[PDB]
Amino acid sequence: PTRFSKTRKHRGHVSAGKGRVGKHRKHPGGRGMAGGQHHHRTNLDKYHPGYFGKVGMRHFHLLRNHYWRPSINIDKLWSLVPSDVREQYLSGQKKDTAPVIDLLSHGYAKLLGKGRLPEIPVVVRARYVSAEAERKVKEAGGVVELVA
Amino acid sequence: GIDLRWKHVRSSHRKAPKSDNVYLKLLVKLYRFLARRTEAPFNKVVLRRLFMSRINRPPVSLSRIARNLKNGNEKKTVVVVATVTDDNRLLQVPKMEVAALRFTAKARARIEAAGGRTLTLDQLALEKPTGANTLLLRGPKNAREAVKHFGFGPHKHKKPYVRSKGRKFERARGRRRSRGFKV
Amino acid sequence: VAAKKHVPIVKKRTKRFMRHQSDRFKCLDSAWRKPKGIDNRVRRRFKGNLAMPSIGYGSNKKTKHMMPSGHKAFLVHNVKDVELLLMHNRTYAAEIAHNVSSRKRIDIITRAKQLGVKVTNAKA
Amino acid sequence: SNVSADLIWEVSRNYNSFLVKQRTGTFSRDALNLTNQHSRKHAGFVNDKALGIVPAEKGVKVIAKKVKAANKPASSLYTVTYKSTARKAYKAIASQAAKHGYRADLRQAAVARASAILRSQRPVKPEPPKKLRGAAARRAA
Amino acid sequence: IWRKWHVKINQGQKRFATASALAASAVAPLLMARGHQVSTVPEVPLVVDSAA
RNA sequence: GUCCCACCCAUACCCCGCCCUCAGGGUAGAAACGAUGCCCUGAGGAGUAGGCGGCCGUGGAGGUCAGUGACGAAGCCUAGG
RNA sequence: AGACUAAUCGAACCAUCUAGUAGCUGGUUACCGCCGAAGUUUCCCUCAGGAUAGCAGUGUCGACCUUCAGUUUUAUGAGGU
RNA sequence: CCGGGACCGAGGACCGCGCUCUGCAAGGAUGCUGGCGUAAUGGUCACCAGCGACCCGUCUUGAAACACGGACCAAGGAGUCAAGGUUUUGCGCGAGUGUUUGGGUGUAAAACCCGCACGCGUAAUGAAAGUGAACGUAGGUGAGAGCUUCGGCGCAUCAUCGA
RNA sequence: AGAGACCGAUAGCGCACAAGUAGAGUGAUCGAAAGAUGAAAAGCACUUUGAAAAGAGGGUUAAAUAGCACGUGAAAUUGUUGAAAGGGAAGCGCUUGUGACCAGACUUGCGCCCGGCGGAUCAUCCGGUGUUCUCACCGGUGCACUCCGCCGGGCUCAGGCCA
Ligand SMILES: [Mg+2]
Ligand SMILES: [Mg+2]
Ligand SMILES: [Mg+2]
Ligand SMILES: [Mg+2]
Ligand SMILES: [Mg+2]
Ligand SMILES: [Mg+2]
Ligand SMILES: [Mg+2]
Ligand SMILES: [Mg+2]
Ligand SMILES: [Mg+2]
Ligand SMILES: [Mg+2]
Ligand SMILES: [Mg+2]
Ligand SMILES: [Mg+2]
Ligand SMILES: [Mg+2]
Ligand SMILES: [Mg+2]
Ligand SMILES: [Mg+2]
Ligand SMILES: [Mg+2]
Ligand SMILES: [Mg+2]
Ligand SMILES: [Mg+2]
Ligand SMILES: [Mg+2]
Ligand SMILES: [Mg+2]
Ligand SMILES: [Mg+2]
Ligand SMILES: [Mg+2]
Ligand SMILES: [Mg+2]
Ligand SMILES: [Mg+2]
Ligand SMILES: [Mg+2]
Ligand SMILES: [Mg+2]
Ligand SMILES: [Mg+2]
Ligand SMILES: [Mg+2]
Ligand SMILES: [Mg+2]
Ligand SMILES: [Mg+2]
Ligand SMILES: [Mg+2]
Ligand SMILES: [Mg+2]
Ligand SMILES: [Mg+2]
Ligand SMILES: [Mg+2]
Ligand SMILES: [Mg+2]
Ligand SMILES: [Mg+2]
Ligand SMILES: [Mg+2]
Ligand SMILES: [Mg+2]
Ligand SMILES: [Mg+2]
Ligand SMILES: [Mg+2]
Ligand SMILES: [Mg+2]
Ligand SMILES: [Mg+2]
Ligand SMILES: [Mg+2]
Ligand SMILES: [Mg+2]
Ligand SMILES: [Mg+2]
Ligand SMILES: [Mg+2]
Ligand SMILES: [Mg+2]
Ligand SMILES: [Mg+2]
Ligand SMILES: [Mg+2]
Ligand SMILES: [Mg+2]
Ligand SMILES: [Mg+2]
Ligand SMILES: [Mg+2]
Ligand SMILES: [Mg+2]
Ligand SMILES: [Mg+2]
Ligand SMILES: [Mg+2]
Ligand SMILES: [Mg+2]
Ligand SMILES: [Mg+2]
Ligand SMILES: [Mg+2]
Ligand SMILES: [Mg+2]
Ligand SMILES: [Mg+2]
Ligand SMILES: [Mg+2]
């Protein structure tokens, strides 16, 4: 919508808000990233510290599928089971049955452990598991088993 | 001549909501009457918070409510002039009654499942016109992505604008003594 | 009928604020325009030149928009519109639009006389 | 509920089909509107209780709104015609609006509107002929 | 010819508005204020007994 | 050259009227209100480059005034209001 | 003789690439209201130009926080005109 | 304590402070009287008179300039559009969010409906192999709006010492 | 072939017309201007002045203030008639005066008392209907010191302009 913009309010005022002494010429200072090392250095060092240089070794023909392993913390583990069944376990009505969670079927490969876990035994099947996550699931009565 | 430093100086705070919601306009009318003819300071604070924009009314969560429901506050009424959000980490939800601007679908269900009650800012004025036995809450104002970029500079430990992250994007000169200097 | 009693009307100015240098060139209308010249003598408020319109020339809020009789003009288009002035005959006056036919013009005047509403342009 | 008299005023505050807005003032061409002004107090079509007066062939005709049948518009108006005497019509209208708490704030306007309608049904006197001041010399020839 | 002619709006907001409009269709004062002539209709949610 | 009386006038100072801007108050067991309204009180107004707000006109599109018109629409002329 | 080669020669004429690039001249369209500058610091094959800090406007939030100040007073230090 | 003159009359039931207290000069003008009811008061336009008044636009420390453009009139004539960023305003849903590449359907370039994948977000850090977030009621101390059984509990955010 | 929040004769393709035409260049090539009488030509017979072009009468038409220089016909520039000013520029600002021309407003309204004319129907009660459930409408009953309209006479209050 052009009916309300600052160009309509500039009618009748010479120079259209760009100044008299500085007249808004074509391209003062250069085009694009010109002057990175010569006259735009002061801007390119106060912000963007690190534009120039080489760091690290290079990799030819990287395939990102080799590096796919999404992770999930341990405090969100109970959120995988459906709500109706979930409330039964926390309320304490089963007392004799344990759930078996399959992380791969939900799209996870590594089980990290960050929060706390209630004292109910579970079984977790993961491709990878952290050292701290294995201890917390074990002290709750459960066990974690690798599945590949 | 009068030799003054300031003249015709305006106010610095909002005096009316910029939103055009019809129902919100009614809610401002109610509390504008209450604040004028009541001595309780609780009414004046609620009125101003109705004017604020969305970034000045950050959401609060169920977990943050349960944090402040201890040390003798289990019987008070929680008032939040913002949205209220369910937390997936909290397994057991305590019993409480909450007066909020709006609730998410899951937050409303889990509050009443435990035996609670969900109120509304208009019903709150009908039950507690003076705000007795209430506690106000806010969300984390600075917990926003855009705030991390504020005040960038050397030796400030802020976040830069980069189109991607990796070893090829910045780092290098000015980030390690192996290439020139460091910041 | 006569209008309500009101305070006396003061205009504060009658001239029309003509445009600078419009009396020497035929390509410029007389409608006022703010001069933006860097060294214009009118913009700098030199002594002995045309004045410039300011908010200090405004009229009283009580007597604003009312003609010297005491009424306020109201543009009408048919006989149904003039009946909106049934309850306002001491504050408002009717005015027939320029595109109304001659036959409908006398219908409005006849109806307006019953209600006592003054008509600004009726002698035709 | 989600609908009330206050809400309808909020939706129709700025523009509605009955609005007549121009310079020097704004008006409303509403049947249930006394004084034909645009205001919450005088907006008949939004309030639950409203009054309206329409001239009949001989006298005034007054219609009121029945709050019990809001959703049924064909039978939502209580109408009555007064054609007996000016003073008798004045008393009935005032009692109809200020005896049982049915818009007692409209008592003064209802009587005044009825007074104007009856005044407009009298025979009109003939206006005196116009005179001439500067064209008198012209017309002498 | 490659200026932006069409626009994209959320399906959630589309459903909110079409539900809001239906609610306003059962309010007789709003019907009159939009210019309709409903002074002689029995009920404002008019329903016909499947004669059509 | 020095000293002493009276008098003359700036858009400056004092008192009064009116306009706008800014700030602080009053108004629902509503006989009520363009609540964006109305009522009461005080102070202030120079400005290029530049910033923001409010409003007026032109060509088209949706809705609405059950709008004006061959008994004369649009356009044009007019020291007539 | 840098002479002549269709009134054109220290490199002819016609169409296209082509709306060739310009730190340099010229222009940049209605009204009212409120606030209101800079020619100085550091770096650049930089000196008719840019980036950086300052001066300026707008949007706000925290309290109405009793905090503040181009000022005087009292006690006590520094200086080499 | 008594004279003389000029300019002004804002407000519109009662309420107040007071006094010389059957009343009043005390929170803002009323009383009596005359001529005329039309060109008389008032308004527009042309001309004479007293005083004031250098040609506009532009670059510039400085323009009425012996600085540049402009003989006159009518129509045309200059911050736009797309992709990608960023902060701020309004709106929907909210640990999630996005129907429209595509399919179903239709009064047919409109409207309405459906889901598998995928994008951004939910976890960081190293060049890399790799590893991967609770001693405590998710901590201690000083300020903090609001609430309070008056003892105290203390959101947002700021500073500081730790995990 | 079907369509548009596109342009409307200096616009839209260079071309709405005998336009890639007229015209320019030895040549490759360059390349315009120009739409509209009326519903229907009914496109002015006949007479008279003139060498002729044409004029004056008289005709057609709703209109010739539409006559093949044709719908509407603006500005720069020009002619005639009317009004006014001028001793080496003119224009313009503030404030009176003279002359010309002109818009408003006022020309009655309300109330009381006496007299006269004309009408059905004021308080009250009964039946029916509606409604805000105590306030009204309709039918009947009134029947002249009541109620309503008009005319004539008398009186109070207010109402235009300058002092
Ligand atoms: Mg400017
Ligand atoms: Mg310029
Ligand atoms: Mg610049
Ligand atoms: Mg260099
Ligand atoms: Mg001043
Ligand atoms: Mg090296
Ligand atoms: Mg004026
Ligand atoms: Mg200057
Ligand atoms: Mg002055
Ligand atoms: Mg002042
Ligand atoms: Mg256009
Ligand atoms: Mg016309
Ligand atoms: Mg030589
Ligand atoms: Mg040649
Ligand atoms: Mg030659
Ligand atoms: Mg060559
Ligand atoms: Mg060439
Ligand atoms: Mg260009
Ligand atoms: Mg070029
Ligand atoms: Mg100013
Ligand atoms: Mg200033
Ligand atoms: Mg220069
Ligand atoms: Mg500032
Ligand atoms: Mg020395
Ligand atoms: Mg020295
Ligand atoms: Mg005053
Ligand atoms: Mg005169
Ligand atoms: Mg002079
Ligand atoms: Mg120079
Ligand atoms: Mg300068
Ligand atoms: Mg100049
Ligand atoms: Mg010179
Ligand atoms: Mg120069
Ligand atoms: Mg030059
Ligand atoms: Mg020249
Ligand atoms: Mg020119
Ligand atoms: Mg000339
Ligand atoms: Mg033009
Ligand atoms: Mg973009
Ligand atoms: Mg997803
Ligand atoms: Mg990694
Ligand atoms: Mg406190
Ligand atoms: Mg045209
Ligand atoms: Mg063309
Ligand atoms: Mg042409
Ligand atoms: Mg054109
Ligand atoms: Mg062409
Ligand atoms: Mg040829
Ligand atoms: Mg033509
Ligand atoms: Mg002839
Ligand atoms: Mg002959
Ligand atoms: Mg004609
Ligand atoms: Mg003829
Ligand atoms: Mg014609
Ligand atoms: Mg011609
Ligand atoms: Mg013509
Ligand atoms: Mg002319
Ligand atoms: Mg001479
Ligand atoms: Mg002169
Ligand atoms: Mg004069
Ligand atoms: Mg009866």
PDB file of N, CA and C in Angstrom, chain C residues 32-87:
ATOM      1  N   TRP C  32      -2.966  29.231  -1.682  1.00  0.00           N
ATOM      2  CA  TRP C  32      -1.780  29.445  -0.866  1.00  0.00           C
ATOM      3  C   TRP C  32      -0.852  28.237  -0.910  1.00  0.00           C
ATOM      4  N   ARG C  33       0.452  28.508  -0.964  1.00  0.00           N
ATOM      5  CA  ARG C  33       1.479  27.479  -0.902  1.00  0.00           C
ATOM      6  C   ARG C  33       2.611  27.960  -0.010  1.00  0.00           C
ATOM      7  N   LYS C  34       3.143  27.058   0.798  1.00  0.00           N
ATOM      8  CA  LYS C  34       4.230  27.414   1.699  1.00  0.00           C
ATOM      9  C   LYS C  34       5.520  27.594   0.907  1.00  0.00           C
ATOM     10  N   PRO C  35       6.193  28.740   1.021  1.00  0.00           N
ATOM     11  CA  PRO C  35       7.447  28.939   0.282  1.00  0.00           C
ATOM     12  C   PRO C  35       8.604  28.223   0.966  1.00  0.00           C
ATOM     13  N   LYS C  36       9.374  27.473   0.180  1.00  0.00           N
ATOM     14  CA  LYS C  36      10.474  26.668   0.695  1.00  0.00           C
ATOM     15  C   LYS C  36      11.841  27.186   0.269  1.00  0.00           C
ATOM     16  N   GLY C  37      11.921  28.408  -0.248  1.00  0.00           N
ATOM     17  CA  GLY C  37      13.195  28.925  -0.705  1.00  0.00           C
ATOM     18  C   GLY C  37      14.164  29.154   0.437  1.00  0.00           C
ATOM     19  N   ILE C  38      15.454  28.993   0.134  1.00  0.00           N
ATOM     20  CA  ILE C  38      16.471  29.144   1.169  1.00  0.00           C
ATOM     21  C   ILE C  38      16.616  30.600   1.584  1.00  0.00           C
ATOM     22  N   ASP C  39      16.382  31.540   0.670  1.00  0.00           N
ATOM     23  CA  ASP C  39      16.522  32.957   0.980  1.00  0.00           C
ATOM     24  C   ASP C  39      15.262  33.733   0.617  1.00  0.00           C
ATOM     25  N   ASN C  40      14.103  33.090   0.725  1.00  0.00           N
ATOM     26  CA  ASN C  40      12.838  33.753   0.449  1.00  0.00           C
ATOM     27  C   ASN C  40      12.533  34.791   1.520  1.00  0.00           C
ATOM     28  N   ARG C  41      12.037  35.951   1.090  1.00  0.00           N
ATOM     29  CA  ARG C  41      11.769  37.033   2.032  1.00  0.00           C
ATOM     30  C   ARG C  41      10.476  36.825   2.808  1.00  0.00           C
ATOM     31  N   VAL C  42       9.505  36.116   2.235  1.00  0.00           N
ATOM     32  CA  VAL C  42       8.263  35.843   2.952  1.00  0.00           C
ATOM     33  C   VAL C  42       8.479  34.788   4.029  1.00  0.00           C
ATOM     34  N   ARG C  43       9.226  33.729   3.709  1.00  0.00           N
ATOM     35  CA  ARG C  43       9.476  32.669   4.680  1.00  0.00           C
ATOM     36  C   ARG C  43      10.266  33.174   5.879  1.00  0.00           C
ATOM     37  N   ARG C  44      11.091  34.197   5.689  1.00  0.00           N
ATOM     38  CA  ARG C  44      11.894  34.754   6.766  1.00  0.00           C
ATOM     39  C   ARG C  44      11.170  35.845   7.539  1.00  0.00           C
ATOM     40  N   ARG C  45       9.913  36.126   7.199  1.00  0.00           N
ATOM     41  CA  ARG C  45       9.085  37.099   7.916  1.00  0.00           C
ATOM     42  C   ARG C  45       9.715  38.489   7.918  1.00  0.00           C
ATOM     43  N   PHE C  46      10.121  38.947   6.740  1.00  0.00           N
ATOM     44  CA  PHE C  46      10.592  40.315   6.609  1.00  0.00           C
ATOM     45  C   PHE C  46       9.437  41.288   6.801  1.00  0.00           C
ATOM     46  N   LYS C  47       9.769  42.497   7.241  1.00  0.00           N
ATOM     47  CA  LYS C  47       8.750  43.503   7.500  1.00  0.00           C
ATOM     48  C   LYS C  47       8.152  44.008   6.194  1.00  0.00           C
ATOM     49  N   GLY C  48       6.826  44.081   6.140  1.00  0.00           N
ATOM     50  CA  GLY C  48       6.145  44.641   4.992  1.00  0.00           C
ATOM     51  C   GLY C  48       5.781  43.670   3.895  1.00  0.00           C
ATOM     52  N   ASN C  49       5.645  42.386   4.198  1.00  0.00           N
ATOM     53  CA  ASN C  49       5.310  41.378   3.201  1.00  0.00           C
ATOM     54  C   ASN C  49       4.043  40.635   3.609  1.00  0.00           C
ATOM     55  N   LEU C  50       3.649  39.679   2.772  1.00  0.00           N
ATOM     56  CA  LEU C  50       2.465  38.878   3.046  1.00  0.00           C
ATOM     57  C   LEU C  50       2.653  38.063   4.317  1.00  0.00           C
ATOM     58  N   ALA C  51       1.569  37.894   5.065  1.00  0.00           N
ATOM     59  CA  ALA C  51       1.599  37.071   6.261  1.00  0.00           C
ATOM     60  C   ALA C  51       1.435  35.599   5.897  1.00  0.00           C
ATOM     61  N   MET C  52       1.661  34.732   6.882  1.00  0.00           N
ATOM     62  CA  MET C  52       1.500  33.305   6.679  1.00  0.00           C
ATOM     63  C   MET C  52       0.455  32.751   7.638  1.00  0.00           C
ATOM     64  N   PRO C  53      -0.348  31.783   7.203  1.00  0.00           N
ATOM     65  CA  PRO C  53      -1.395  31.247   8.081  1.00  0.00           C
ATOM     66  C   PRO C  53      -0.811  30.495   9.264  1.00  0.00           C
ATOM     67  N   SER C  54      -1.422  30.697  10.429  1.00  0.00           N
ATOM     68  CA  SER C  54      -1.001  30.059  11.665  1.00  0.00           C
ATOM     69  C   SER C  54      -2.222  29.539  12.408  1.00  0.00           C
ATOM     70  N   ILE C  55      -1.975  28.638  13.361  1.00  0.00           N
ATOM     71  CA  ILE C  55      -3.048  28.114  14.195  1.00  0.00           C
ATOM     72  C   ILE C  55      -3.613  29.157  15.141  1.00  0.00           C
ATOM     73  N   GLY C  56      -2.945  30.294  15.290  1.00  0.00           N
ATOM     74  CA  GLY C  56      -3.445  31.358  16.130  1.00  0.00           C
ATOM     75  C   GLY C  56      -4.526  32.204  15.509  1.00  0.00           C
ATOM     76  N   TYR C  57      -4.891  31.929  14.263  1.00  0.00           N
ATOM     77  CA  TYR C  57      -5.975  32.624  13.586  1.00  0.00           C
ATOM     78  C   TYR C  57      -7.309  31.909  13.731  1.00  0.00           C
ATOM     79  N   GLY C  58      -7.355  30.802  14.467  1.00  0.00           N
ATOM     80  CA  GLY C  58      -8.571  30.023  14.558  1.00  0.00           C
ATOM     81  C   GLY C  58      -9.694  30.776  15.242  1.00  0.00           C
ATOM     82  N   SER C  59     -10.910  30.301  15.006  1.00  0.00           N
ATOM     83  CA  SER C  59     -12.113  30.926  15.533  1.00  0.00           C
ATOM     84  C   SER C  59     -12.585  30.215  16.794  1.00  0.00           C
ATOM     85  N   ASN C  60     -13.483  30.884  17.514  1.00  0.00           N
ATOM     86  CA  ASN C  60     -14.006  30.353  18.764  1.00  0.00           C
ATOM     87  C   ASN C  60     -14.719  29.029  18.530  1.00  0.00           C
ATOM     88  N   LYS C  61     -14.521  28.084  19.451  1.00  0.00           N
ATOM     89  CA  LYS C  61     -15.186  26.790  19.324  1.00  0.00           C
ATOM     90  C   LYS C  61     -16.696  26.920  19.436  1.00  0.00           C
ATOM     91  N   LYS C  62     -17.179  27.940  20.146  1.00  0.00           N
ATOM     92  CA  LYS C  62     -18.618  28.094  20.328  1.00  0.00           C
ATOM     93  C   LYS C  62     -19.300  28.530  19.038  1.00  0.00           C
ATOM     94  N   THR C  63     -18.687  29.453  18.298  1.00  0.00           N
ATOM     95  CA  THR C  63     -19.291  30.024  17.102  1.00  0.00           C
ATOM     96  C   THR C  63     -18.660  29.505  15.816  1.00  0.00           C
ATOM     97  N   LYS C  64     -17.918  28.408  15.885  1.00  0.00           N
ATOM     98  CA  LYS C  64     -17.307  27.847  14.689  1.00  0.00           C
ATOM     99  C   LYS C  64     -18.362  27.190  13.810  1.00  0.00           C
ATOM    100  N   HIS C  65     -18.210  27.358  12.495  1.00  0.00           N
ATOM    101  CA  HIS C  65     -18.991  26.717  11.434  1.00  0.00           C
ATOM    102  C   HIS C  65     -20.387  27.297  11.258  1.00  0.00           C
ATOM    103  N   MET C  66     -20.715  28.415  11.896  1.00  0.00           N
ATOM    104  CA  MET C  66     -22.054  28.980  11.827  1.00  0.00           C
ATOM    105  C   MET C  66     -22.049  30.274  11.024  1.00  0.00           C
ATOM    106  N   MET C  67     -23.018  30.395  10.117  1.00  0.00           N
ATOM    107  CA  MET C  67     -23.146  31.575   9.281  1.00  0.00           C
ATOM    108  C   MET C  67     -23.731  32.732  10.091  1.00  0.00           C
ATOM    109  N   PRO C  68     -23.619  33.970   9.594  1.00  0.00           N
ATOM    110  CA  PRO C  68     -23.970  35.132  10.433  1.00  0.00           C
ATOM    111  C   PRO C  68     -25.385  35.110  10.984  1.00  0.00           C
ATOM    112  N   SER C  69     -26.311  34.381  10.361  1.00  0.00           N
ATOM    113  CA  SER C  69     -27.640  34.241  10.943  1.00  0.00           C
ATOM    114  C   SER C  69     -27.580  33.538  12.291  1.00  0.00           C
ATOM    115  N   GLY C  70     -26.790  32.473  12.386  1.00  0.00           N
ATOM    116  CA  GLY C  70     -26.668  31.722  13.617  1.00  0.00           C
ATOM    117  C   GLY C  70     -26.833  30.233  13.406  1.00  0.00           C
ATOM    118  N   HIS C  71     -27.172  29.841  12.185  1.00  0.00           N
ATOM    119  CA  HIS C  71     -27.412  28.450  11.841  1.00  0.00           C
ATOM    120  C   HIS C  71     -26.167  27.828  11.219  1.00  0.00           C
ATOM    121  N   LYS C  72     -26.233  26.518  11.002  1.00  0.00           N
ATOM    122  CA  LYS C  72     -25.177  25.769  10.339  1.00  0.00           C
ATOM    123  C   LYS C  72     -25.748  25.111   9.093  1.00  0.00           C
ATOM    124  N   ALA C  73     -25.026  25.216   7.984  1.00  0.00           N
ATOM    125  CA  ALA C  73     -25.525  24.695   6.722  1.00  0.00           C
ATOM    126  C   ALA C  73     -25.589  23.173   6.742  1.00  0.00           C
ATOM    127  N   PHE C  74     -26.556  22.632   6.007  1.00  0.00           N
ATOM    128  CA  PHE C  74     -26.725  21.188   5.883  1.00  0.00           C
ATOM    129  C   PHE C  74     -27.225  20.885   4.480  1.00  0.00           C
ATOM    130  N   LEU C  75     -26.457  20.103   3.729  1.00  0.00           N
ATOM    131  CA  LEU C  75     -26.768  19.847   2.331  1.00  0.00           C
ATOM    132  C   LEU C  75     -27.812  18.744   2.215  1.00  0.00           C
ATOM    133  N   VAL C  76     -28.886  19.020   1.478  1.00  0.00           N
ATOM    134  CA  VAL C  76     -29.979  18.074   1.306  1.00  0.00           C
ATOM    135  C   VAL C  76     -30.104  17.726  -0.171  1.00  0.00           C
ATOM    136  N   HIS C  77     -30.714  16.572  -0.434  1.00  0.00           N
ATOM    137  CA  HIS C  77     -30.860  16.071  -1.794  1.00  0.00           C
ATOM    138  C   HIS C  77     -32.284  15.703  -2.182  1.00  0.00           C
ATOM    139  N   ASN C  78     -33.185  15.487  -1.232  1.00  0.00           N
ATOM    140  CA  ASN C  78     -34.562  15.128  -1.544  1.00  0.00           C
ATOM    141  C   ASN C  78     -35.433  15.523  -0.359  1.00  0.00           C
ATOM    142  N   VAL C  79     -36.711  15.145  -0.413  1.00  0.00           N
ATOM    143  CA  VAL C  79     -37.632  15.508   0.658  1.00  0.00           C
ATOM    144  C   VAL C  79     -37.444  14.635   1.892  1.00  0.00           C
ATOM    145  N   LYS C  80     -36.870  13.441   1.740  1.00  0.00           N
ATOM    146  CA  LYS C  80     -36.643  12.591   2.902  1.00  0.00           C
ATOM    147  C   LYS C  80     -35.492  13.103   3.754  1.00  0.00           C
ATOM    148  N   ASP C  81     -34.530  13.797   3.143  1.00  0.00           N
ATOM    149  CA  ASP C  81     -33.374  14.273   3.892  1.00  0.00           C
ATOM    150  C   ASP C  81     -33.728  15.467   4.768  1.00  0.00           C
ATOM    151  N   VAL C  82     -34.581  16.366   4.273  1.00  0.00           N
ATOM    152  CA  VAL C  82     -34.918  17.560   5.038  1.00  0.00           C
ATOM    153  C   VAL C  82     -35.690  17.216   6.304  1.00  0.00           C
ATOM    154  N   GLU C  83     -36.328  16.046   6.354  1.00  0.00           N
ATOM    155  CA  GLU C  83     -37.031  15.639   7.561  1.00  0.00           C
ATOM    156  C   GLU C  83     -36.086  15.242   8.686  1.00  0.00           C
ATOM    157  N   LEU C  84     -34.792  15.075   8.399  1.00  0.00           N
ATOM    158  CA  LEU C  84     -33.820  14.845   9.461  1.00  0.00           C
ATOM    159  C   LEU C  84     -33.632  16.073  10.337  1.00  0.00           C
ATOM    160  N   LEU C  85     -34.038  17.247   9.859  1.00  0.00           N
ATOM    161  CA  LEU C  85     -33.922  18.488  10.605  1.00  0.00           C
ATOM    162  C   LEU C  85     -35.180  18.814  11.396  1.00  0.00           C
ATOM    163  N   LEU C  86     -36.017  17.814  11.676  1.00  0.00           N
ATOM    164  CA  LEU C  86     -37.262  18.066  12.392  1.00  0.00           C
ATOM    165  C   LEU C  86     -36.995  18.625  13.783  1.00  0.00           C
ATOM    166  N   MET C  87     -36.047  18.031  14.500  1.00  0.00           N
ATOM    167  CA  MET C  87     -35.746  18.441  15.863  1.00  0.00           C
ATOM    168  C   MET C  87     -34.687  19.528  15.943  1.00  0.00           C
TER     169      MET C  87
END
